[PDB]
Each structure stands twice: as C-alpha cells, then as structure tokens.
Design a binder for this molecule. Structure first.
Ligand SMILES: O=C(O)CCCC(=O)Nc1ccc(/C=C/c2ccccc2)cc1
Lengths: 209, 214
C-alpha cells in the first residue's frame, strides 16, 4: 500500500512549541521534495515548508524562523518542529509528497490557544406533548459546551438520513446538533446517537426515549 | 509564484448532464519533459481532500472515467460527465511544477433539482438540560431546495430575534437538498416566564409559511 500518516497534533498555548511527525508506507522520503501544508477555517490550503532530496529547506515568510522541517532518511520520517506558535497557526497540517502524482495524509490538528479542553454535553431531541407521532419522525441530539471543535456524531452506525450541522462557537465553546429521520413503524426499536470527542477522550451515548 | 485562478461557483448543473470547471495559471505548467504539472482535487464537507486527476490528464486511484481534464499549458477545464448527486463539493486546481506550491481558490459544484419544502421539527428544552439551568429550543428545517430560506422565532406571539443561532449544511450528497437548524438559547428562568414558542420557516417555494410551535 501507499499512504502517509501525520501525527503529533493537539492543543498548544500561544508561544509554545510542538513537533509533528510523518511516516509512510510505499514512499521513500529521501528521494523527494517533501512538504507540509496546512488547512485553516477558510478551507484554502497554505504551504508551510518543503525540503528537497538534497536537504535544502524552503519556507514562506509566515513561518520562516519559527518552523523547521527535517527528515530522518534512515527511519523514513518527516518532521515539522514548530516554535513561538501563534493563534494564526491553528489548522489541520498535512504531510505531502507533491511531485508527480501528489500524495498526502489525513492530516493532524494543531490548536493554539489558552482555552481549556472541555467535554461535550449531549441532550436528546425527541417529540413530547402533541407531536406528529406518525410515519417518518425527526429525532436528534444537541451537543454543546465542548472544545476543541473536533466531535463526531454517529447513529447506530447505520445512519443514512442523518443531518449533522456545522458546529458554532459560543462564548468560547462549540455547539452543534444532529438530526435523524426514521419511519414511526420502527421508532420503538432503539435509536441511539453516539457522540465522540477524542479531545477529551469522551464518548457519550444517548438513547432517545 | 504561479497563481491559480478559478471562479468560486459554476452554474447549477442538472443531474445526468456535464459540468465544466475552468482554471488558469499565470505560467505554463507544460514541462520540458512533455508533462503538464496540473492536478485537480476534491473537497467534500466532512472529508479530507481527494485527488482526482494529476499530470493534467491522468486519473487518480478510484476515480471514475466520468472525470477528465483538458487544456493548454495555462488554461484548463475539468469536465464531469453525467453528474451524480454525490459529486457535490468544491473542486480545486493546483500546480506541482515548481515551488512554492500554489492552489486555486476552488470552485463549488452546484446541483440543480426540483424544489422542495422544508420538513420542520421543533423540540423544547430537554429535562436533562433544564436540570442544569440551561434552556435551548431547537427546530430543524430539513431537505429543502433552493438553499435560500429564512426562519423567524416568536415567543408568546412576540418576535424573539435575539439569542438565536442558525447553522446550514452544504448540498446533500444524496438528495441534493439543503438543511439547517435554528437554536434559540436562553436561561431556564427566561424560558419559564413564557409558554408557547414558535419556529417559523418562510421559504420561496410556497406562500404558506410552514410554522411549528408548542
Ligand atoms: O520538482 C519540483 O520542484 C516540483 C514539485 C514541487 C512540490 O513538491 N509541490 C507540491 C508540494 C506539496 C503539495 C501538497 C498538496 C496537498 C493537497 C491537498 C491536501 C494536502 C496537500 C502539492 C505540490
């Protein structure tokens, strides 16, 4: 197989440092111009650093002097040592073999802030007094008060009518809801929303009624 | 730097027909070896970027031949034949001819379909939430089309515009519709001194605003 895997991301205080790493199967880093790129909220990729096969390093002004890209040719590992981190550095960082047919990993999240990692509060959203109790019912789970943003809502895994809305920041904490739809002829069969928040190593399962 | 330019949007495309996404570079991407170093990738909501085409005309792994790219060294066109609902997302062109790596701003692919009214479902604060002092009322306006819509809140007949938060999804990869949620957040105290909350949704399809209250 051929794949790149970034790791090392997480929460960091402004002015702090962090070291990202990248390993791969099927790609020999020493032979290429290897790079690091990052994806911020804007969702438009930004080049962070590159290192040629010759070992020459390249950096944009945005990180010049604070970031250092390096490679361990023997163990086949790519690194990105970050320092004097700024809030503007918050993003999803990708490791990439850009030449020819580009390859990149799933990315690793780096969050720079003083804020605290808070677990999510999950509240069930089901029909109560006087509702459209019939064919096709809209159920849901409200998730609020968490941080960082990365959170995943899964419905019995077999969810095809799910609608997970973009999380919104509120007073420093994120909030989002997820709705699901199923025919009333199967409502009394157990509908559960599983909220996962790796940031706080928390997973909350709420069974609607 | 080699600047890559694409329009932010393209006209809505009918399912089953072809879509064309343009892109241009400030410098030819045609290398001396005869290869043109242009690649295209796709970004769908909640997914990592996916390579579609590289070296101008080579399909990446798992990419159906409905996708193709053509053009010169500075002007290119990504073509998607027989557009499918799952094709919605943002298409990016980029160059890997030289450093520094540069990328286009991305072009969002819009799918045109038949109008649809929003399925509205409202929910009162949960008991578990009230026991903590909080009080947020939620209502979903799901699977509607077009994406243009507007929700209004009414507490005891009065309009409560303050304290409301709205969140919209991207075009659905399956049904090509849009969805959104409206959440009026307040203290359990403010919530108690009232009763009868209204989630009003006025679309442009019908003249009968679908309103739900409790
Ligand atoms: O020989 C040369 O100088 C030309 C090659 C230069 C090069 O590596 N370019 C290059 C470097 C990195 C990328 C990364 C692209 C990417 C795209 C999507 C997600 C994550 C990363 C894309 C291209």
């Amino acid at each position: 197989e051929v794949k790149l895997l970034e790791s090392g991301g997480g929460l960091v205080k402004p002015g702090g440092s962090l070291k990202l790493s990248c390993t791969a199967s099927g790609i020999t880093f020493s032979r290429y111009i290897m790079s690091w790129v990052r994806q911020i909220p804007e969702k438009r990729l930004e080049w962070v650093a590159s290192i040629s096969s010759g070992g020459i390093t390249y950096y944009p002004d945005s990180v010049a002097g604070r970031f250092t890209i390096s490679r361990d040719n023997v163990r086949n590992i790519l690194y990105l040592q970050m320092s004097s981190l700024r809030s503007e550095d918050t993003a999803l960082y990708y490791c990439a073999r850009g030449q020819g047919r580009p390859y990149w990993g799933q990315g690793t999240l780096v969050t720079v802030s003083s804020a605290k990692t808070t677990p999510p509060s999950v509240y069930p959203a089901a029909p109560g007094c006087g509702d459209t109790t019939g064919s096709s019912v809209t159920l849901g789970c409200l998730v609020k008060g968490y941080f960082p943003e990365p959170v995943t809502v899964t419905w019995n895994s077999g969810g095809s009518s799910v609608h997970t809305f973009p999380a919104l920041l509120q007073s420093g904490l994120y909030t989002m809801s997820s709705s699901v739809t199923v025919p009333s002829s199967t409502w009394p069969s157990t509908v559960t929303c599983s909220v996962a928040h790796p940031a706080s190593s928390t997973t909350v399962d709420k069974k609607l009624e | 730097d080699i600047v890559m330019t694409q329009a932010a949007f393209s006209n809505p495309v009918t399912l089953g027909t072809s879509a064309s996404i343009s892109c241009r570079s400030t410098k030819s991407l045609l290398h001396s070896n005869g290869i043109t170093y242009l690649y295209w990738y796709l970004q769908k909501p909640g997914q990592s970027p996916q390579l579609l085409i590289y070296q101008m005309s080579n399909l990446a792994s798992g990419v159906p031949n409905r996708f193709s790219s053509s053009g010169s060294g500075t002007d290119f066109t990504l073509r998607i034949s027989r557009v499918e609902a799952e094709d919605v997302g943002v298409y990016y062109c980029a160059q890997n001819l030289e450093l520094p790596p540069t990328f286009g701003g991305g072009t969002k692919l819009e799918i045109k379909r038949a109008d649809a009214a929003p399925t509205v479902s409202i929910f009162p604060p949960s008991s578990e939430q009230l026991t903590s002092g909080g009080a947020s009322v939620v209502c979903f306006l799901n699977n509607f089309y077009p994406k243009d819509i507007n929700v209004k809140w009414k507490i005891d007949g009065s309009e409560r515009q303050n304290g409301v938060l709205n969140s919209w999804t991207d075009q659905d990869s399956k049904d090509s519709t849009y969805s959104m949620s409206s959440t009026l957040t307040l203290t359990k105290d403010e919530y108690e001194r009232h009763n009868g909350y209204t989630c009003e949704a006025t679309h442009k399809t019908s003249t009968s605003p679908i309103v739900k209250s409790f």
